[PDB]
């Protein structure tokens, strides 16, 4: 879950950025706070997740929430993998066995809703003496950003 759009309790702000002012910051990789007013309520909201990195091409680079999801996924996987094969005394191991273990791990995450989808066949494993190379892909989660609405008034 991203910090995007979530409210904040801050009493007040020095400057109240306009819609265009906010757009310039966010497009240039600046995270800001937005003000809104209800009938009798007021909120301060985090407009979006953006890092200093500017390019919109790759969500992992731009949105820290997406990159964070990848970060914890890989780090938790590798440390577990280190324990099973490197740490624990393993007598034998094959590339395919590693491939199955990886697929088992990813399937569990989907069952826990941590990841929405992924390619099963994209995984690659190579072993070379005392070293192994692992390559895989997972689709980042996409959040809901824009809604456009139009109204039509009519008689009767």
């Amino acid at each position: 879950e991203s910090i995007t759009f979530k409210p904040l309790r801050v009493s007040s702000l020095d400057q109240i950025y306009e819609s265009i002012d906010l757009d310039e910051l966010n497009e240039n990789g600046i995270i800001s706070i937005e003000f809104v007013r209800n009938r009798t309520n007021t909120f301060f909201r985090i407009v979006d997740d953006v890092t200093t990195f500017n390019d919109k091409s790759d969500p992992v680079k731009a949105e820290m929430a997406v990159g964070e999801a990848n970060d914890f996924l890989v780090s938790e996987l590798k440390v577990q993998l280190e324990d099973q094969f490197i740490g624990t005394r393993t007598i034998n191991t094959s590339a395919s066995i590693i491939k199955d273990f990886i697929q088992s791990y990813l399937g569990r995450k989907k069952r826990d809703n941590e990841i929405q989808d992924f390619p099963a066949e994209d995984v690659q494993v190579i072993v070379e003496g005392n070293e192994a190379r692992i390559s895989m892909t997972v689709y980042p989660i996409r959040s809901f950003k824009k809604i456009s609405v139009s109204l039509v008034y009519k008689q009767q």
Partner: protein, 141 residues
């Protein structure tokens, strides 16, 4: 000569592996899966108009000769009491002796019942039955 187009699997071309460790003196294993197919019967037909999948139940059994060391109890894979509650899931792999490629793997295996037989005229044997979440035959060629 050896034409691979007709080869079959046997007890001498298979390995049973847990956590990378090959379980020793393992004798047999059986796997079951039930999709719970059920038919749909209309009023104006005795025949089933169609079948539908409803429920996935699967179990795997393993028979072994109790080695003096590395038995299922000593390995920590099985359990004998409340220690079970702290036992996490495991994955049981059937891997090819020749290539070390995988033939079938069971994910999220959990233990169901435990049986051991002490007998006078025969070697000691123990049997375990697991219940698994899903099966997989990936990582092929």
């Amino acid at each position: 000569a050896s034409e691979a187009k007709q080869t079959v699997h046997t007890g001498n071309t298979v390995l049973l592996m847990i956590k990378g460790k090959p379980v020793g003196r393992a004798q047999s294993a059986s796997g079951q899966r039930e999709y719970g197919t059920t038919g749909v019967y209309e009023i104006g037909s005795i025949m089933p108009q169609e079948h539908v999948y409803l429920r996935y139940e699967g179990t795997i059994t393993v028979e072994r000769l109790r080695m003096k060391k590395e038995n299922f109890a000593d390995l920590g894979y099985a359990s004998l009491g409340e220690e079970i509650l702290k036992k996490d899931i495991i994955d049981i792999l059937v891997v090819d002796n020749l290539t070390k490629q995988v033939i079938i793997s069971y994910h999220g295996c959990s233990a169901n019942n435990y049986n051991e037989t002490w007998q006078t005229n025969e070697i000691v044997t123990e049997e375990i039955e697991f219940s698994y979440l899903t099966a997989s035959d990936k990582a092929r060629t």
